[PDB]
Design a protein around this ligand. Structure first.
Ligand SMILES: CCCCCCCCCCCCCCCCCC(=O)OC[C@H](COP(=O)([O-])OCC(O)COP(=O)([O-])OC[C@@H](COC(=O)CCCCCCCCCCCCCCCCC)OC(=O)CCCCCCCCCCCCCCCCC)OC(=O)CCCCCCCCCCCCCCCCC
Ligand SMILES: CCCCCCCCCCCCCCCCCC(=O)OC[C@H](COP(=O)([O-])OCC(O)COP(=O)([O-])OC[C@@H](COC(=O)CCCCCCCCCCCCCCCCC)OC(=O)CCCCCCCCCCCCCCCCC)OC(=O)CCCCCCCCCCCCCCCCC
Ligand SMILES: CC(C)=CCC/C(C)=C/CC/C(C)=C/CC/C(C)=C/CC/C(C)=C/CC/C(C)=C/CC/C(C)=C/CC/C(C)=C/CC/C(C)=C/CC1=C(C)C(=O)c2ccccc2C1=O
Ligand SMILES: CC(C)=CCC/C(C)=C/CC/C(C)=C/CC/C(C)=C/CC/C(C)=C\CC/C(C)=C/CC/C(C)=C/CC/C(C)=C/CC/C(C)=C/CC1=C(C)C(=O)c2ccccc2C1=O
Ligand SMILES: CC(C)=CCC/C(C)=C\CC/C(C)=C/CC/C(C)=C/CC/C(C)=C/CC/C(C)=C/CC/C(C)=C/CC/C(C)=C/CC/C(C)=C\CC1=C(C)C(=O)c2ccccc2C1=O
Ligand SMILES: CCCCCCCCCCCCCCCC(=O)O[C@H](COC(=O)CCCCCCC[C@@H](C)CCCCCCCCC)COP(=O)(O)O[C@H]1[C@H](O)[C@H](O)[C@H](O)[C@@H](O)[C@@H]1O
Ligand SMILES: CCCCCCCCCCCCCCCC(=O)O[C@H](COC(=O)CCCCCCC[C@@H](C)CCCCCCCCC)COP(=O)(O)O[C@H]1[C@H](O)[C@H](O)[C@H](O)[C@@H](O)[C@@H]1O
Ligand code: HEM
Ligand code: HEM
Ligand SMILES: CCCCCCCCCCCCCCCC(=O)OC[C@H](C)OC(=O)CCCCCCCC[C@@H](C)CCCCCCCC
Ligand code: FES
Ligand code: FES
Lengths: 535, 55, 382, 382, 53
């Protein structure tokens, strides 16, 4: 009697505790059903998969520089001195059943985590979800992005590899020693000595499996709690206002679709871990200061920092008996990048004057200057990433390596400007298109007038039509406009039988008019609620 | 002898199948990041567009 | 406007759901089932579709189980029967797992989009500026806690608590971080000129005056005799060889005392050097640095491999251009001239090792680098 | 019974605190200040007392800082000037830190107990069985979510989702745990009788038929020649020596190839053995096990050190009692008889190594243990 | 010495004595025989992240 068991368990729960009101509030919480609001969930799900795979990895990983000869199964690396970290990474790859798959899905989850964090940041920035109520949310999310970047750095640096080791040597060691007053001291504190200090990988292992994941988990908890209680913002729409949330309740629909989305994201990541090879360390010999490779790139989320290193033009200053190497330039650049990213909402409000409580998102077209600035920043980030990749770009796409370096150097001040101008004008022209639709109706096929030979596109008005043909223009309300009669009530009733065979006409008619009734009922309910809010 | 060993390694690395799926060229970070951003992120974003709504 | 003391008994499920929405500030508008018409076969087809997706997920999960338990996993040497099975083993694990969970997710999404009823529930958002009753009551509670405590009236306690907390925090933070803090300039590495700091000294620093440091070539032999003495004739015009600072005392790796000295030589960050043979025809284009004019032994030039910018090895030697390129950040150093950077982030030349030949003709270092060899840092160029 | 729309403006702090308590179900009774009478000098003394405690905390925190920054820390070898300072270095760190924070805590407690007003606030506890409105509305919401979803009507979906989730969970759990699951009885250790399991084989198992396994004494020499061949004359009546299975091939630790075989010998769980010289007077009290009657060489008996119960070494030896005691759980084995347990948790006798002397008189195992030597397990005694 | 002796007693002997799966649990935990080269890394993971989490 599962129904009786459920009832008895509910009564016992509500007697021991009293979660009825709280649970009802959680279940009844309404979440907007916009697709772009799942971008953060992608990052959350990738993070969960990262935790689950990282536990498995830690069950088999040994962090240490203790030198050992492999003497494993992988023949191409036998008798070669390597760190125990590399040896156990190879053991995960080969000796452990499914260890290669687990580590590959872990790395793919890391890449998807960074990518989805970037996409979510783009969504919120361009939609203006950081304004008065949620600047703190933006700030903690920026800290979260920085932590994710650096944890991925430490994660692919954990198995001491040739690629990851040379990346560490460059970024960490060089840029740390570069810092003027405390650079060498920071280097010695972090590595416990010179660069190959025998505590580096244990320290990174701790930072990567316990410390940084703990901070990220706490910050994700704060992030999700803030989103939960500062009810999720929404785009302007029929019944959507600054003081309501139009969407679906948590329990019946949102919970089911979020769980299913998590399942599908897990499936995508597992499929990638299977079919796509990620970081094949066995091809990469154990780290040695002398051995190198041509590629020498970090993961894509640090590729922009590496590209900054490459592109910045070797400007070194030599104060009285001292040196200020080119690494400090990039250190300051990264500092500026993070500072501006964290402080943008406050910069935005200082610049514009907006101190209003904003609960309705802005369309990126509707906010041109911010959209232009975001496009400019994305262009700069892409230029830096492809500058880091300039080695492989030059190799495959036959471009001189010097040519790619200087393309990056010039474009990091030219391409941002071009993209800013283009994005600003593009946003304004999207606004112009929206107003054209508002004032003339949707466009359709052309018709030749009866008496004379005029051609008229035979538009379709979206609002009340004047006594004559031309309609009364509507007022823009911040919501997208249907520019195709495709997406309106036109040409949308295929035979509802099946792909290969029809259904009885009675069934088809019943279904089609039932759907018509349901959709017009939804439209009428939204219209009535909209009229009720002010009217 | 050393040159023969290097030749053997070159041939082995050239003819060795990629363990753990399609080997995206041989360059790790750049092909892997591109494959993420295309395959994984287009899949995720398209699935999000399917599940959610446009408005 | 009443809590429904006894009407809940006869209130139906729909009425109770509406009441809950009302209490929570949620008004459910157009909660309509997906299949109002009963008995239609489109409903059965959609049912079968979601069932097929869930069953595909289950079959793929069973496939994951079966392939994981029974498949030719385990590394297979090159060109051996079973290599193909091993190579597509992990792909099969990932394919089965991902397909299973993806199909389950697709089935769940289809159930939500086809069977779970459609709603446009609208929740009243009470964001911002809690009602004045709550605000003023919280303010009163906090202010009463602060003032009643009699703080901001015991000046001695106010200052003493601040001093105590500040001193304790100072002591605790300093004791937390002093374990990590180390002096980079503590003289530790022994040298002919007494113990010196690590950054100044590399494997090429003479431990005792007049020590012989051979430019030993690092044969890839796994462990035994990894470094072997080197002769100028071994290199030929337009050739580069990575050499290391090997000492007679640092004999082959057969012993346990050795194979730690050799491991230290191999793992020395500033140890590896590139010995390049400048072509005799191109020897006339060489421009030499101050104090490094006699460093080259005839047409042999020894430059540190560590890039002068962030310290990656600069191994990519290009002959017929005499350019030592670094792969980490694409910086070229003109080997013909003193190895000065002529492109890329680097701004300082690579340190040039003084080389010569000892008795028996083996290549040895004729001294130490006249400058610190790794990447630059604050305490440099003086 | 009204929310005080505009009365809050003139409501005082006490009234607002009472209102908040009322809203939260909290009635603050007897919230009285500690010092109603003003100007008294007992108040000043108590103020100064809490101030003194906080100032002691601050002074001790500064002491922690100064001691940590400037104290003769670092190990001092022994009987060395500075050894006394080092010995109380860490105690001083802990003393200063603990005293500082303890004094801060004492000051805070005294401030609470002497200055913060005393209250006996009583909160209304609404525990158990949320009101029927909430219970029934939650039940209605959950039941509407379940039934409206149309589940428990699509038997094919109900069963398919269960099958899919179960299969996926099975596959995922098996894939998670199969990396760990290893077969204990995979024949890996080579032996004269082919590869055998690790539990069956020890360091005393002859790798090839007729192999010589000397009972090498483990000298404490740090690294070089750790194991040295042994002779019966070395022990004297009532003597115990810990010996290991040393092979001629496992030469001294000078080489890198050696010092790994030797490390394996030292770290072998089942390798160490105790060689006991039974006193000739007491040799007549010896009882011998089935198949172990000729194992002893004259008055030499070689018993495994690993205790038969949980595998700790049984290293303690009592002569004139001939009792091999295990420190882990106080189990005694009668060495006179076959090393059968005559006390403690152990129930199985220690395995007896056959021993003899080869040419030159060096002690060598005359075979292998006729039983598994470590602690017992399921697959044993057959 | 002390703590490793404690491990050898409890974690190894007790685990390996369990009738049906004792040796299997021992080998799964230790990656092999008792002194398996992964015991302390596994305990480190368990002790800094997994169990404290
Ligand atoms: C970690 C990462 C993983 C993800 C985790 C993050 C998830 C966050 C989502 C939040 C959801 C939530 O908390 O809902 C709970 C929610 C609590 O809030 P509520 O009920 O709405 O109360 C009124 C409002 O909270 C009153 O609030 P308001 O609407 O007036 O606005 C005030 C708001 C102001 O807004 C904020 O500032 C909120 C943001 C908080 C900042 C950071 C706090 C979170 C840090 C998390 C760190 C994690 C590590 O302050 C808060 O409410 C803060 C609440 C902090 C909870 C955060 C939870 C995490 O209700 C429940 O408790 C429902 C669950 C009932 C549980 C019992 C079930 C049966 C019992 C069985 C026990 C054993 C059975 C054996 C028999
Ligand atoms: C890479 C190339 C792979 C080969 C596939 C080439 C065929 C591409 C057809 C898409 C072109 C049509 C289009 O632009 O609009 C499609 C779609 C909707 O366009 P819309 O008309 O403006 O939106 C209104 C719809 O009614 C929106 O209504 P809806 O959301 O309900 O429409 C969903 C129906 C229709 O919408 C779609 O999603 C169509 C996409 C079906 C192709 C994906 C399956 C075949 C490839 C699987 C990988 C093997 O969804 C489905 O039936 C299940 C599709 C699940 C999405 C999986 C996409 C990611 C996998 C492909 C990337 C992995 C590459 C590995 C190699 O937007 C997309 O971009 C879909 C994602 C594009 C996937 C290709 C990635 C490149
Ligand atoms: C710092 C910086 C950006 C310097 C400039 C270097 C650079 C990126 C130059 C452009 C590269 C191109 C497009 C070369 C083709 C020749 C060329 C320049 C033609 C004119 C360009 C032009 C305006 C054309 C008009 C039409 C048009 C837009 C054509 C674009 C054609 C292309 C290539 C579109 C895709 C863009 C693309 C993928 C560029 C390469 C970027 C990267 C990082 C690829 C990474 C990558 C590599 C490198 C693999 O080898 C690989 C192997 C196996 C699996 C995966 C991969 C993989 O993902
Ligand atoms: C970026 C932004 C919105 C900034 C707001 C303005 C602001 C506050 C600026 C202050 C900070 C500064 C100084 C910024 C300038 C430069 C900058 C952004 C530095 C920080 C870099 C950083 C930590 C985060 C930026 C992340 C971000 C928003 C990236 C763009 C993400 C978006 C919208 C992607 C499009 C969605 C989509 C379908 C992507 C997949 C399709 C493809 C292939 C897109 C192109 C593409 C991309 C996008 C890659 O990332 C990539 C990485 C590695 C190899 C190849 C590729 C590649 O081909
Ligand atoms: C060889 C080998 C070892 C292979 C294995 C690889 C490995 C090591 C690890 C991965 C293996 C595993 C365990 C994979 C499965 C992962 C997993 C649990 C998937 C669940 C997805 C699934 C099976 C769905 C079935 C379809 C279905 C009926 C769905 C509806 C019921 C379900 C499952 C609902 C789940 C809801 C869900 C995702 C809850 C997440 C809980 C968390 C952390 C946060 C909740 C939460 C969410 C989700 C928000 O979106 C949100 C947005 C704004 C503000 C706040 C929140 C918020 O608090
Ligand atoms: C959900 C995940 C779905 C992922 C799809 C997975 C794809 C499966 C691929 C096939 C099965 C696995 C193959 C494993 C074995 C294997 O590795 O595959 C090579 C082939 O490789 C190639 O050429 C490329 C062939 C082109 C088809 C594959 C392209 C798929 C890309 C597009 C997927 C990533 C997305 C990137 C988007 C990019 C656009 C950005 C806008 C084949 O040998 P070969 O061809 O000879 O490789 C040479 C050595 O020999 C030789 O030494 C060596 O030196 C080389 O020359 C080497 O090429
Ligand atoms: C407000 C606090 C004011 C005090 C600031 C103290 C920092 C200045 C140091 C002053 C004394 C320096 C000379 C005497 C000492 C000396 O000679 O040591 C030196 C290195 O100074 C040390 O000792 C440890 C430094 C202590 C950590 C300082 C942390 C920074 C402070 C400023 C931040 C916290 C303060 C609160 C403000 C923030 C509030 C938060 C809002 C060199 O090391 P070395 O010769 O190699 O020996 C090594 C042994 O030291 C080493 O502990 C050991 O680990 C070994 O590794 C060994 O190598
Ligand atoms: C670990 C990284 C992250 C996780 C797990 C995460 C998760 C989420 C989720 C699930 C949401 C609600 C759904 C949505 O709005 O799409 C959200 C909202 C938000 N995120 Fe994040 N996100 C992350 C990174 C970031 C970054 C890099 C920023 C900058 C940021 C700022 C915000 C803001 C301002 C919101 C509020 C949007 C709203 O109210 O609708 N987050 N986050
Ligand atoms: C939170 C975000 C995380 C990110 C972005 C991340 C990223 C990464 C990446 C990219 C790798 C390289 C994998 C490879 O090269 O095969 C890695 C390795 C590793 N990760 Fe993480 N990780 C995260 C969380 C965790 C957690 C929570 C744990 C522990 C529970 C963990 C444990 C490990 C271990 C042990 C390794 C080394 C395994 C190996 O070398 O193959 N990671 N990480
Ligand atoms: C990372 C931040 C980088 C901070 C650099 C701090 C430089 C301190 C030492 C400068 C110096 O005087 O050394 C001698 C100099 C090299 O030679 C000359 O006297 C003529 C040089 C003409 C070029 C001047 C350009 C100055 C630009 C910076 C002020 C802008 C920094 C932002
Ligand atoms: S690391 Fe060599 S040029 Fe930058
Ligand atoms: S360990 Fe020896 S008696 Fe228990």
């Amino acid at each position: 009697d599962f129904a009786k068991l459920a009832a008895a368990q509910g009564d016992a729960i509500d007697s021991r505790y009293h979660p009825s009101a709280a649970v009802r509030r959680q279940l009844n919480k309404v979440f907007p059903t916009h697709w772009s609001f799942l971008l953060g969930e992608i990052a959350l799900y990738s993070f969960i998969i990262l935790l689950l795979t990282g536990v498995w990895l830690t069950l088999f990983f040994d962090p240490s520089m203790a030198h050992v000869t492999y003497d494993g199964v992988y023949q191409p690396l036998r008798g070669v001195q390597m760190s125990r970290a590399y040896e156990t990474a190879l053991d995960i790859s080969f000796e452990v059943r499914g260890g290669l798959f687990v580590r590959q899905v872990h790395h793919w989850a890391a890449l998807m985590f960074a990518a989805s964090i970037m996409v979510h940041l783009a969504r919120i920035f361009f939609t203006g979800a950081f304004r008065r109520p949620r600047e703190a949310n933006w700030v903690i999310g920026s800290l979260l992005l920085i932590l994710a970047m650096f944890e991925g750095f430490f994660g692919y640096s954990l198995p001491d590899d040739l690629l990851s080791g040379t990346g560490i040597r460059a970024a960490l060691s060089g840029i740390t020693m570069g810092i003027p007053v405390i650079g060498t001291w920071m280097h010695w504190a972090l590595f416990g000595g010179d660069f190959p200090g025998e505590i580096l990988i244990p320290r990174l292992y701790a930072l990567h499996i316990l410390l940084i994941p703990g901070i990220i988990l706490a910050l994700i908890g704060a992030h999700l709690a803030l989103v939960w209680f500062q009810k999720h913002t929404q785009f302007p729409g029929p019944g959507r206002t600054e003081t309501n949330v139009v969407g679906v309740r948590v329990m019946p629909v949102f919970a089911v679709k979020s769980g299913a989305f998590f399942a599908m994201i897990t499936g995508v990541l597992g499929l990638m871990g299977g079919l796509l090879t990620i970081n094949p360390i066995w091809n990469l010999g154990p780290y040695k200061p002398s051995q190198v490779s041509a590629g020498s790139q970090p993961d894509f989320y640090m590729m922009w920092t590496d590209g900054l290193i490459r592109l910045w033009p070797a400007w070194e200053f030599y104060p009285f008996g001292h040196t200020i190497p080119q690494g400090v330039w990039v250190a300051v650049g990264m500092g500026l990048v993070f500072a501006l990213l964290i402080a943008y909402p406050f910069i935005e409000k200082k610049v514009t004057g907006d101190d209003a409580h904003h609960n309705l998102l802005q369309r990126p077209r509707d906010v041109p200057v911010r959209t232009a600035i975001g496009s400019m920043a994305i262009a700069l980030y892409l230029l830096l990433t492809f500058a880091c990749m300039n080695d492989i770009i030059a190799l495959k796409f036959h471009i001189s390596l010097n040519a790619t370096t200087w393309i990056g150097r010039i474009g990091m001040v030219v391409l941002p400007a071009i993209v800013y101008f283009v994005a600003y004008r593009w946003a304004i022209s999207l606004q112009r298109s929206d107003r054209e639709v508002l004032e003339h109706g949707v466009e359709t096929g052309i018709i030749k007038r009866l008496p004379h030979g005029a051609y008229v596109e035979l538009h379709q008005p979206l609002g009340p039509v004047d006594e004559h043909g031309h309609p009364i223009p509507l007022e823009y309300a911040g919501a997208p406009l249907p520019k195709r009669m495709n997406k309106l009530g036109s040409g949308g009733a295929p035979g509802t039988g099946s792909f290969l065979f029809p259904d009885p006409a009675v069934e088809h008619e019943a279904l089609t008019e039932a759907a018509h009734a349901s959709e017009h009922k939804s439209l009428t309910a939204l219209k009535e609620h909209q009229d009720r809010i002010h009217g | 002898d050393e040159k023969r060993d290097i030749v053997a390694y070159v041939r082995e690395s050239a003819e060795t199948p990629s363990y753990g799926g399609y080997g995206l060229g041989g360059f790790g970070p750049a092909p892997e990041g591109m494959a993420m951003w295309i395959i994984g992120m287009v899949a995720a974003i398209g699935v999000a567009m399917w599940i959610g709504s446009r408005a | 406007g009443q809590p429904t003391d006894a009407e809940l008994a006869e209130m139906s499920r729909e009425e109770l759901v509406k009441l809950g929405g009302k209490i929570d500030g949620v008004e459910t508008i157009f909660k309509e089932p997906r299949w109002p018409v009963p008995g239609t076969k489109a409903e059965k087809r959609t049912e079968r579709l979601v069932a097929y997706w869930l069953m595909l997920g289950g079959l793929s999960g069973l496939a994951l189980l079966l392939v994981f338990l029974f498949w030719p996993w385990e590394y297979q040497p090159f060109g051996s029967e079973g290599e193909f099975l091993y190579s597509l083993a992990t792909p099969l694990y990932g394919l089965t797992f991902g397909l299973s969970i993806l199909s389950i997710g697709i089935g769940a999404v289809l159930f939500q989009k086809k069977f779970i009823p459609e709603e446009i529930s609208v929740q009243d958002r009470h964001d911002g500026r809690s009602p004045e009753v709550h605000r003023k009551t919280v303010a009163a509670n906090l202010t009463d806690a602060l003032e009643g405590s009699t703080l901001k009236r015991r000046k001695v306690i106010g200052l003493s608590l601040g001093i105590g907390l500040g001193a304790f925090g100072a002591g605790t933070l300093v004791a937390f971080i002093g374990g990590l803090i180390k002096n980079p300039w503590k003289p530790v590495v022994p040298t002919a000129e007494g113990k010196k700091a690590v950054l100044w000294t590399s494997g090429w620093t003479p431990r005792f005056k007049g020590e012989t440091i051979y430019l030993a070539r690092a044969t890839g032999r796994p462990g035994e005799s990894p470094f072997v003495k080197m002769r100028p004739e071994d290199i030929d015009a337009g050739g580069m060889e990575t050499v290391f600072p090997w000492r007679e005392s640092d004999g082959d790796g057969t012993t346990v005392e050795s194979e730690h000295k050799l491991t230290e030589i191999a793992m020395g960050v500033r140890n590896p050097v590139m010995l390049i043979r400048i072509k005799p025809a191109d020897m006339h284009r060489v421009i030499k640095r101050k104090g490094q004019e006699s460093f080259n032994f005839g047409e042999l030039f020894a430059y540190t491999k560590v890039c002068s910018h962030l310290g990656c090895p600069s191994s990519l030697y290009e002959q017929q251009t005499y350019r030592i390129l670094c792969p980490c950040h694409q910086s070229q150093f003109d080997a013909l001239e003193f190895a000065k950077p002529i492109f890329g982030p680097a701004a300082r030349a690579l340190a040039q090792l003084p080389i010569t030949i000892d008795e028996d003709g083996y290549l040895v270092a004729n001294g130490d680098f006249v400058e610190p060899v790794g990447p630059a840092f604050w305490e440099r160029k003086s």
